[PDB]
Amino acid sequence: GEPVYADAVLNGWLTSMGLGVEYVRAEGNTVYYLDDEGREVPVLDHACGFGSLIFGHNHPEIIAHAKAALDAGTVVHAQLSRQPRANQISRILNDIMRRETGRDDRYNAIFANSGAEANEICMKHAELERQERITALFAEIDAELDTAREALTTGTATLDTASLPLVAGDVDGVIADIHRHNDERRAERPLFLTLDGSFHGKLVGSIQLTQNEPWRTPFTALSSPARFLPADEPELIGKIVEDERRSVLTLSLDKDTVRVVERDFPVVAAIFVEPVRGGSGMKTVTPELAEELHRLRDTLGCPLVVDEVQTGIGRTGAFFGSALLGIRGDYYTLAKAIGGGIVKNSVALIRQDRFLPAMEVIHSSTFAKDGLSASIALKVLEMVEADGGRVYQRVRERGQRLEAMLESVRADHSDVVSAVWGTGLMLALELRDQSNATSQAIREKAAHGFLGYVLAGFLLREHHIRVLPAGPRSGFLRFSPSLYITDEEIDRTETALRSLFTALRDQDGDRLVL
């Protein structure tokens, strides 16, 4: 009935899913809402900012640091001055990367405010690399034209007319039609390669790189497209990228004879990959696929960009998921957990032998590289590295525990659960399709793509546990809690799930759907 200035549709929808609740306080792995009588009810949080809260909500040590930084009158806005904290942060990340990959590469850091902004820095820099490639090729092509003409008009060579259906009739005329052709091509828009089910952001550039169809397809006309390569079938990937070859024309001299010929054009600006893929449902990159991506990157001459916005800061059980999994990228990006659960920060890391110094003075952003997020970033890095790397060891063993009880629930409920996916504290259950379900109310939700959200509402209202779905038809349930998740909390989750998947088995849509 009444005026409403945000969230109306979003709120309506959440309520019907059974998720209309306001959390008023948070600490550790627990968030609180108020019941009818005004009491705080504790809820266990498995969503955790979609992975942002590796140390839980409002970790005391991070809050203290932030308050100290505020109390010291940290310079938050200090644009175009010396801010050595950036260098300090990038130095630490560089060290960690060496230690986890064995490789001795060095990286330059550009800081931003979100994961999508980090990736789009990489997009932009990739296009800078591509333009350099293009300038170098076109320069060569000129000199190949020059040489062919001063051989063709000075005596010494003839133009083989079998070559001519690429473009003819006459010398200067053919040069023009080649210049024409190449310029059309040069100004054509680049292509990005990404993986099926990829999620790389939702901004004008980065949304094109995100699989999910209702999120992307409305905005298709805005920005350069990506091809989504199939992860399970690496053998199809070679052919798909071949289809995307485009050539430019030039004149090649063989002392005596001159021919017009095709010559490779760089259309692909970059290849993007997630070590663990949210939108496919926490599926990790296989060694097979990593090797295909390395081939492509070697073959095309473009950077491989490793999106660690979600997988990074320890959640997989190393700092870098890529290092765990053996993905040798050329750019890396980071965000989410680096803000410590309280602020917004992100970073692109770009290898220094590819880095183009223009980028450092032609890209900028008002909020980026601020002092407060900077200081908090140094803190978070301090904390995950502490005590000889014992934090990763705790991530790994907490993850092992949680994967086991998840695997044990599957085993008893395989009629509704297909698979457990993921690694470390970044895990998911795959639900079996329920579009053919007995219960009319369940089946209708499944048809609408809302099954997972509905199940998450059951978990909430009946077991006070907060889970959120992943995947394009909300067909996965995500678990990415903090490393402080207790065994008793993991037991309470096992109880909750067995209850859920027994109701689903029984097809009890009265209980599941509101």
Ligand X SMILES: *Cc1c(COP(=O)(O)O)cnc(C)c1O
Which residue in 13, 33, 8 sits closest to 514, CA to CA? 13
Q: Out of 147, 286, 365, 486, point to the residue binding a second copy (CB under 8 A).
A: 365
Phi, psi of 361 (to 5 degrees): -120, -10
Residue 73 CA to residue 71 CA, distance in Å, equals 5
Q: Give yes or no for residue 354 binding a second copy (CB under 8 A).
A: no
Cβ atoms < 10 Å from Cβ of 187: 7
Residue numbers 160-199 binding ligand X by CB under 6 A: 199
| CA distance readout (Å), 368 to 89, 244, 292, 364, 374 | 14, 36, 35, 7, 9
Residue 439 CA to residue 436 CA, distance in Å, equals 9
Q: Give yes or no for residue 200 binding ligand X (CB under 6 A).
A: yes
With CB under 5 to 8 Å by kind, the binding choice for 147 among a second copy, ligand X, none is: none
Residue numbers 117-146 binding a second copy by CB under 8 A: 117, 120, 123-124, 127-128, 131
With CB under 5 to 8 Å by kind, the binding choice for 307 among ligand X, a second copy, none is: ligand X
Own/partner long-range contacts of 498-503 (Cβ < 8 Å, ≥24 apart): 498/409, 498/412, 498/413, 499/462, 499/463, 500/455, 500/458, 500/459, 500/463, 501/409, 501/413, 501/416, 501/417, 502/413, 503/458
Nearer of residues 189 and 239 to a second copy, judged by Cβ: 189
Residue nearest to ligand X (CB): 115
| Residue window 280-319: x/- pattern of binding to a second copy, with contact defined by CB under 8 A | ----------------------------------------
**Residue 103 Cβ, how far from ligand X at the closest point, in Å?**
23
Q: Across the strands, what pairs with 469?
A: 477
Q: Out of 202, 259, 351, 473, point to the residue binding a second copy (CB under 8 A).
A: 202
49: left (phi over 0), alpha (psi -120 to 50) or beta: left
Residue 329 CA to residue 327 CA, distance in Å, equals 6
Q: With contact defined as beta carbons under 8 Å apart, do 494 and 500 qualify?
A: no
Task: Check whether 366 is labelled as a binding-site residue.
Answer: yes
Q: Give yes or no for residue 314 binding ligand X (CB under 6 A).
A: no
**Residue 468 Cβ, how far from a second copy at the closest point, in Å?**
6
Residue numbers 257-276 binding ligand X by CB under 6 A: 274
Identify the three-state secondary structure at position 356.
coil
With CB under 5 to 8 Å by kind, the binding choice for 197 among a second copy, ligand X, none is: none
Residue numbers 2-61 binding a second copy by CB under 8 A: 3-11, 13-14, 19-27, 31, 47-50, 52-53, 57-58
Q: Return the range that interacts with a second copy (CB under 8 A); candidates 150-158, 207-215, 230-238, 420-428.
A: 207-215
| Distance, C-alpha 369 to centroid of its chain | 21
Nearer of residues 1 and 357 to a second copy, judged by Cβ: 357
Residue numbers 291-310 binding ligand X by CB under 6 A: 307, 309-310
**Residue 328 Cβ, how far from ligand X at the closest point, in Å?**
19
Residue 67 CA to residue 342 CA, distance in Å, equals 11
452: left (phi over 0), alpha (psi -120 to 50) or beta: alpha
Identify the three-state secondary structure at position 27.
strand
| Residue window 106-125: x/- pattern of binding to ligand X, with contact defined by CB under 6 A | --------xxx---------
- Residues of each annotated binding site for pyridoxal 5'-phosphate: 115-116, 307, 310, 366
- Residues of each annotated binding site: 115-116, 307, 310, 366
Interacting residues toward ligand X by CB under 6 A:
50, 114-116, 199-201, 274, 278, 307, 309-310, 335, 365-367
